[PDB]
Amino acid sequence: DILRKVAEIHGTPTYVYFEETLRKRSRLVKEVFEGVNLLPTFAVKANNNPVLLKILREEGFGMDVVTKGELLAAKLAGVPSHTVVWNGNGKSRDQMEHFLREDVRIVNVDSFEEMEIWRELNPEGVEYFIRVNPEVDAKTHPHISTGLKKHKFGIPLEDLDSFMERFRSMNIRGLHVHIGSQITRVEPFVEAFSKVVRASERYGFEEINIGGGWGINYSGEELDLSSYREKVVPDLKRFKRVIVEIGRYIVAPSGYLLLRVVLVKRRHNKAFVVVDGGMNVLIRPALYSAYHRIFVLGKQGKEMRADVVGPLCESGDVIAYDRELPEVEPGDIIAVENAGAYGYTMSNNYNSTTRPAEVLVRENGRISLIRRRETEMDIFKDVVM
Numbered sequence: 091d092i093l094r095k096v097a098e099i100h101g102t103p104t105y106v107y108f109e110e111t112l113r114k115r116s117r118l119v120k121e122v123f124e125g126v127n128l129l130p131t132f133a134v135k136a137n138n139n140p141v142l143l144k145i146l147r148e149e150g151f152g153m154d155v156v157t158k159g160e161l162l163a164a165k166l167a168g169v170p171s172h173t174v175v176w177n178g179n180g181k182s183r184d185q186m187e188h189f190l191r192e193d194v195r196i197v198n199v200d201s202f203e204e205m206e207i208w209r210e211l212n213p214e215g216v217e218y219f220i221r222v223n224p225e226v227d228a229k230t231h232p233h234i235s236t237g238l239k240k241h242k243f244g245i246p247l248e249d250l251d252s253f254m255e256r257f258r259s260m261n262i263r264g265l266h267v268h269i270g271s272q273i274t275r276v277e278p279f280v281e282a283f284s285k286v287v288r289a290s291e292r293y294g295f296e297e298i299n300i301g302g303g304w305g306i307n308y309s310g311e312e313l314d315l316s317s318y319r320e321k322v323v324p325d326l327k328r329f330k331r332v333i334v335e336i337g338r339y340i341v342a343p344s345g346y347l348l349l350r351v352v353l354v355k356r357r358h359n360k361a362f363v364v365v366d367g368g369m370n371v372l373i374r375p376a377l378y379s380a381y382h383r384i385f386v387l388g389k390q391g392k393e394m395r396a397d398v399v400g401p402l403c404e405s406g407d408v409i410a411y412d413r414e415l416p417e418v419e420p421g422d423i424i425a426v427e428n429a430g431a432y433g434y435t436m437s438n439n440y441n442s443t444t445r446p447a448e449v450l451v452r453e454n455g456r457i458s459l460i461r462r463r464e465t466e467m468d469i470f471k472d473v474v475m
């Protein structure tokens with residue numbers, strides 16, 4: 091009833107997060123690294139609601155931030171600035187001075203050009219990690235490999251020497267590697283990390299930031315944590331500090347997306363269950379094509395086959411394609427699972443729609459609104475007439 095409870099009180103579309111899941115998954119990540127001197131951080135890009143970030147701070151997580159905006163979410167969540175790690179490929183001098191005024195002291199440098207700007211400021215107390223892109227076996231994980239050869243981030247790991255030649259003597263404490271997202275195989279991590287750890291040992295670095303990217307079960311895949319703890323963690327044990335930057339694995343399962351069915355449109359062979367939010371609420375299915383399982387609150391069955399689509403005047407405004415479902419009726423509620431990451435953070439106002447509400451079901455059972463629903467006036471809040 092709990093999910094319907096929330097829809098009755100707060101309406102739809104509404105993301106609903108469970109504190110219990112957020113704490114258990116964050117504790118699960120820490121436990122994988124038992125034996126390691128870990129500084130766990132949460133990737134704010136996956137979910138920036140400060141109420142959820144406060145829960146993660148209580149669980150011992152710092153924050154991986156990219157923008158001023160992310161840094162403010164951390165501040166709103168009462169995160170101590172010495173547990174913030176700053177990532178980014180477009181750090182401007184203005185941004186650096188701002189981050190320095192906030193006492194951020196851990197920076198994952200993306201390029202030679204960024205490092206030259208840091209020297210012109212020459213801040214004291216800042217620890218730098220150099221983002222590197224290890225070569226990953228092209229014929230096996232072809233998708234992680236070309237991203238780490240063609241994407242705009244970091245420097246090739248083969249060019250680390252060229253970077254250290256120019257910048258030696260700055261407070262460079264280690265390397266940062268982040269190889270991708272939604273990874274459920276352990277081998278890519280073992281391959282990339284063994285190279286980065288080897289490189290770290292040549293320079294004698296005592297810290298390392300191994301990024302994030304752990305995948306979740308969207309349609310049946312699962313990252314084997316036993317295998318990961320057996321194959322990856324031992325290499326990490328030497329370091330005085332290991333930082334990880336986890337987003338999706340922690341927050342995605344904590345969230346559902348609730349949508350009310352407006353009508354069920356039949357067209358011969360096919361059926362379109364039209365709900366009250368689409369790509370303006372959850373963009374993943376139309377931008378990434380990711381698969382989220384769905385279900386109907388209070389109903390089970392397989393008598394209908396349908397696409398679940400949004401109300402927007404756009405062709406790929408689809409939440410779910412070809413799913414078996416019970417006989418859906420207008421007014422039913424569809425719940426989309428694994429909606430807690432890259433969900434609200436990618437919501438928008440396309441077709442002059444309003445952004446969804448967010449609610450938190452606390453461990454004590456209290457249902458708390460943590461993100462009100464945009465009004466129609468909110469859509470035009472910044473128009474200057």
Ligand SMILES: Cc1ncc(COP(=O)(O)O)c(C=O)c1O
Nearest residue numbers: 133268271302303335336337338
């Ligand atoms: C540098 C960095 N670290 C960690 C993460 C995210 O990983 P995920 O949410 O897959 O854990 C991101 C995501 O963009 C990132 O860019």
